[PDB]
Design a protein around this ligand. Structure first.
Ligand SMILES: O=P(O)(O)OC[C@H]1O[C@@H](O[C@H]2[C@H](O)[C@@H](O)[C@H](O)O[C@@H]2CO)[C@H](O)[C@@H](O)[C@@H]1O
Ligand SMILES: O=P(O)(O)OC[C@H]1O[C@@H](O)[C@H](O)[C@@H](O)[C@@H]1O
Lengths: 461, 462
């Protein structure tokens, strides 16, 4: 018999500041690296950018009212560092803090738990200009000063905090694939910036223990659990390599403060291991989180990759390469649909680290059709969410401590590079890639489905 | 890719177990072990074979050590028979029993061979079973500790490497779940209680070791079959998660971290099978970190989804996993997988999960060796098996696993627990069979000279 969801389960939904807020130059806000990057011609679909997005900065009262109508138990959002410190360091911007204060008060007045995410990829451009942002150890103290400011202003009202959201994405996309700022393709630089981000995460967790002694904090990891293609020993070995290189490389640092040794030795043999300073290991080991945040969309299957092989398939020669998994469904965008993979990832985190898990992001991006009468029938989104929630219930029954589930996303939002048409929200926003239209909010069918999930604490899916 | 060499102090070894080699079952004051009694029950063992004589290593140890020195062994791993040292398990120490192990250790040291002493290989004295049920009573924790401390005091000056419980998962599961080994019980609840007591005994002895052998290295040895999923079907990967945790982490997480894994614990709790925990248990288990994980390795196991009405050929646990033949590995003549890459995988998994050095305490090939005219045994099949495993160990070292040594199973042919003598494991053939001891003469197999050359070249010629 499946166990019920625990009574205080945080049924949530989530967003990110650049993707929803707009108001990119209002109330003293400084430029973020994304304000600049997205205005490079050709970088984003149809030149879409975060100047307005879905205008949540001005429409937050309506959006929170919709959350209360749904009965959301928690809303996870990120704070835009450039609103609080327009230059990254230096003078605090009270008008920027005041927006988040008003948002938090609106949530609390409706009984919704805020989950504050410190960082979703939008370091102030001034810090990139001054010292290269995440490539400089200077960012450790600047990020800590920013985080401490938020802990001081909001710790009395916010119990749950996420530090770096998807560090593995912003680091790898920014420094290895060149898809995100700063547009670099250099593995050596990637691992250096990654190490600095690890130190920044640990430093802010240490600060949190002083300023928010009753709070709960953790990083959030974009987790694609690895599978071996089959039981061929060389494919199982490729899986060992891939899970360690892609997943333990981050989560072991978060949980244990140590990089895994086989991956470290491989990077050292390539001259790619990060520079370690005295005190680094002590800091990383002394910053235990209360939970592991998990952003989940799909698993990855791997197979053996000879030393002259792949490096379609991607991988590392001599370690592993990816291969299409014939045993999982796909979305209309070729993302795998693997709800059991979420249960597997949750089981792996509990088994390896004994940590509670907050699922910070999971959802389905698809074209939605607006029908006359302001009707959006998104049964495909209900199907996807239902199947993932069902597997979470099985993970809970197995013994995993899952603190909550934040569906991605509450309203439709701006994609980093792909505009607006692949929508994720429970709430449709009437705008597209060419026009803001009237920006009106329209509840999708999935809104009412999730409302009923919450009312029954997951008993009716 | 440049392979790393075997480290300069790598323990090229071979191994045995006391009941399987010693004989002298009632000599020099030795008391009855549970195996002395069990193997004499009609029908328990093939052709009634038992350890009364075995290969008579108790009397022939000088000849056997001389062969080890001829081979150039760096280490010899053996077990101490508790019933020789404390015939009743507790009570009076038997000095003649200690004197045998003293003579053996001196013989090894005089030939430059490192002794690796194994405290327990399944032979608890029958008197402790009679009095209180042996591993089912917490009384065994202090009795085992007193025995271990006796050995630490007598031999700690000359023995650096110690193994505590050898293959706890086997003696506990075979003794209390499958009923194949003493005490012949089939009761999962009793199995998990005895297993918990064995965990506490292991931790207690490691704590004592820190007091008595401060420069030594100690660890348990686990019979490790690394699990594989059959394929990338999500339900088969989940079956693998269940199987690796339930079959492997259940033991190794206690050894390394002092904690049982939660999903397995909750499953047992739902069946009414979780062990009874006393105040102080977690503190003891957590405060007994080993210096290494010992690994007894023969093969991997591949698993697939098993519905709640499923298998309980294939074996498994309904709702968790079931085994399935792996189509991508060869098998021995007894349907055991031959999977040397699986040894590398298991070594990588232990380093990745626990960051522990590993002593491979047992690995070998059992086969029906033919004694040819001229006292020749051509066991190229054994050479091939060992060569491939040693090659994969070198790759694991190159990956970054700290492997302390490799003990081939076995040095001489020996008595199997239930299956007699015909399926042989030694580098040294022993002339006897299931019907009689013949003359017990020792005959070097071809593999003896192969391993001699491996050791001489520190693994460069395999
Ligand atoms: O509109 P898109 O391109 O589908 O983006 C949706 C969300 O993507 C999340 O990150 C993804 C990323 O898109 C993938 O490229 C990467 O491989 O996986 C990560 C896993 O999260 C972002 O978290 C979110 O801000 C986007 O809305
Ligand atoms: O002869 P069998 O049944 O294959 O057993 C071989 C070996 O099996 C191993 O599990 C034991 O550790 C050894 O003690 C034993 O010799």
């Amino acid at each position: 018999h499946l166990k019920p969801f625990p009574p205080e389960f945080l049924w949530g939904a989530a967003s990110a500041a650049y993707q929803v807020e707009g108001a990119w130059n209002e109330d003293g806000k400084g430029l973020s690296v994304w304000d600049v990057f997205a205005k490079q011609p050709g970088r984003t679909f149809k030149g879409t950018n975060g100047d307005v997005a879905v205008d949540h900065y001005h429409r937050y009262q309506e959006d929170v009212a919709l959350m209360a109508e749904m009965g959301l138990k928690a809303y996870r959002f990120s704070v835009s560092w450039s609103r609080v410190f327009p230059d990254g360091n230096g003078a605090v911007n009270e008008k920027g803090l005041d927006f988040y204060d008003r948002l938090i008060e609106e949530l609390r007045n409706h009984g919704i738990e805020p989950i504050v995410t410190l960082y979703h990829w939008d370091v102030p451009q001034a810090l990139m200009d001054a010292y290269g942002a995440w490539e400089s150890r200077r960012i450790i103290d600047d990020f800590d000063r920013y985080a401490v400011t938020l802990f001081q202003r909001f710790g009395d009202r916010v119990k749950y905090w996420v530090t770096l959201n998807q560090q593995n994405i912003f680091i790898s996309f920014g420094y290895r694939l060149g898809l995100h700022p700063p547009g670099v393709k250099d593995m050596k630089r990637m691992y250096e910036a990654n190490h600095i981000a690890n130190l920044a995460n640990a430093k802010v967790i240490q600060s949190f223990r002083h300023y928010v002694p009753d709070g709960k904090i953790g990083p959030s990891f974009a987790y694609s659990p690895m599978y071996p293609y089959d039981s061929r020993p060389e494919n199982v070995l490729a899986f060992e390599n891939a899970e360690e290189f892609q997943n333990h490389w981050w989560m072991d640092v978060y949980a244990w403060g140590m990089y895994p040794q086989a991956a470290w030795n491989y990077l050292e043999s390539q001259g790619l291991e990060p520079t370690v300073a005295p005190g680094d290991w002590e800091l990383l080991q002394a910053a235990k989180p209360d939970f592991m945040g998990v952003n989940y969309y799909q698993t990855t299957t791997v197979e053996h990759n000879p030393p002259d092989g792949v490096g379609t398939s991607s991988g590392i020669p001599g370690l592993f390469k990816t291969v299409r998994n014939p045993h999982v469904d796909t979305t209309n965008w070729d993302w795998a649909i693997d709800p059991v993979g979420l249960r597997i990832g949750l089981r792996r985190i509990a088994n390896r680290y004994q940590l509670p898990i907050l699922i910070t992001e999971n959802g389905l991006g698809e074209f939605d059709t607006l029908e006359p009468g302001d009707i959006v029938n998104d049964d495909y989104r209900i199907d996807y969410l239902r199947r993932h929630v069902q597997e979470i219930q099985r993970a809970i029954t197995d013994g995993v401590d899952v603190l909550g589930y934040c569906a991605w996303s509450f309203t439709d939002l701006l994609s980093w590079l792909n505009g607006y048409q692949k929508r994720y929200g429970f709430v449709y926003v009437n705008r597209d890639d060419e026009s803001e239209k009237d920006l009106r909010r329209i509840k999708k069918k999935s809104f009412y489905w999730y409302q009923r999930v919450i009312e029954t604490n997951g008993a009716e899916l």
